[PDB]
Amino acid sequence: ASKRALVILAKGAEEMETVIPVDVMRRAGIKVTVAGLAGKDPVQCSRDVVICPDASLEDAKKEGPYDVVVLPGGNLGAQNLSESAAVKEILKEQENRKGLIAAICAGPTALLAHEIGFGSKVTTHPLAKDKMMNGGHYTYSENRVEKDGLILTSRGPGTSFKFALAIVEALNGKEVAAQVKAPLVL
Amino acid sequence: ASKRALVILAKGAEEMETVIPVDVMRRAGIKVTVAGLAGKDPVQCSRDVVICPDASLEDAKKEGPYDVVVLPGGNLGAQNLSESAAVKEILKEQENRKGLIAAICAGPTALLAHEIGFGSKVTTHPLAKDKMMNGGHYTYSENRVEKDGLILTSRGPGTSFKFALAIVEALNGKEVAAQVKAPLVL
């Protein structure tokens, strides 16, 4: 059986933080669905890269559950994730079934919006710390990747490989992560 | 005036090696055109990310010249670049006007196919070395980024940030590269 990942792609997402996890997880033999928040239409990312999702979020949500739900960053992408009732439902479900949730850069602020994983140790992009920490519902970390149980967080474009490999390790183990890492030239 | 980059996107391109340079160059204030080799249609990358180009290569070539021409890797993407007469013409023109050419992973093997930059020091992905070195027309390097005059090469997904920042430095200078780098959390 292979593990399955849902990557929720919204307008304004950081395209590096979208593509690096998708690509690295597919290298790991994970079945990844890139789901468009607003439907199956093309998504204009933060630096104007346009990505065609595999499915709408509407459809992808009917096909879970997923072994990981991944939230890319980008300030505007994260705001769109934070405002979505569909994202709230997916994350609550995932938390309740004790499934991994992985969020990078501003992405973890959607956890705050949806009241996910309170009491966890988290990191974010430095510029998103104050938003994440409003109310003191999480404990902050400056590690490049932080994992507290089923909440996996990371900091920015430059930590995306480490973040993606941490997802691979959580799902498929250390050996697979190491095998995937070598040909990346990291 | 802003500098201009042409990124040539072919089926089978390594999507990380496409998106990381595009995004980092746009952060640097470079005007980037993501040009589809086969036209303006969506491009299915090596790990199945689908990117919508900004323009066809046919149209983008009419709008140069460009301060850098960027060739992503991916074994199949690089083969498509290597087989294209349009790519040959663009690279020859760029070499003749003494413009930068930047290629990552298997991407530099398109330089070999098109007889570009012979006698240069280059690197590639380790698995592409033998292809690149057929005939001994280049001198090989294991540095993560190699620059010999106007030929700029790099090794793999994991060197893409360094590669992109090297392009930024070449075009816009050290200070801009350092300013762009900090918020990446590298």
UniProtKB/Swiss-Prot annotation, chains A, B:
It is an enzyme of class 3 (hydrolase). The modification N6-succinyllysine is found at K181. The keyword Cell membrane applies. InterPro entries: Class_I_gatase-like, DJ-1, DJ-1/PfpI, Prot/Nucl_acid_deglycase. Gene3D superfamilies: 3.40.50.880. One of its GO terms (cellular component) is cytosol. It is found in: Cell membrane; Cytoplasm; Nucleus; Membrane raft. Sumoylated on Lys-129 by PIAS2 or PIAS4; which is enhanced after ultraviolet irradiation and essential for cell-growth promoting activity and transforming activity. Cys-105 is easily oxidized to sulfinic acid. Induction: By hydrogen peroxide and UV irradiation. In pancreatic islets, expression increases under hyperglycemic conditions. Expression is also induced by sulforaphane, an isothiocyanate obtained from cruciferous vegetables. GO terms for molecular function: cadherin binding; copper ion binding; cupric ion binding; cuprous ion binding; cytokine binding; DNA-binding transcription factor binding; enzyme activator activity; enzyme binding. Deglycase activity does not require glutathione as a cofactor, however, glycated glutathione constitutes a PARK7 substrate. The active site is at C105, H125. There is a cross-link at K129 (Glycyl lysine isopeptide (Lys-Gly) (interchain with G-Cter in SUMO)). Changing C105D: Abolishes oxidation and association with mitochondria. No effect on chaperone activity. The record marks D148, G149 as: Cleavage. It holds the Pfam family DJ-1_PfpI. Homodimer. Binds EFCAB6/DJBP and PIAS2. Part of a ternary complex containing PARK7, EFCAB6/DJBP and AR. Interacts (via N-terminus) with OTUD7B. Interacts with BBS1, HIPK1, CLCF1 and MTERF. Forms a complex with PINK1 and PRKN. Interacts (via C-terminus) with NCF1; the interaction is enhanced by LPS and modulates NCF1 phosphorylation and membrane translocation. Interacts with NENF. Multifunctional protein with controversial molecular function which plays an important role in cell protection against oxidative stress and cell death acting as oxidative stress sensor and redox-sensitive chaperone and protease. It is involved in neuroprotective mechanisms like the stabilization of NFE2L2 and PINK1 proteins, male fertility as a positive regulator of androgen signaling pathway as well as cell growth and transformation through, for instance, the modulation of NF-kappa-B signaling pathway. This is Parkinson disease protein 7. It comes from Homo sapiens (Human). The lineage of its organism: Eukaryota, Metazoa, Chordata, Craniata, Vertebrata. The gene is PARK7.
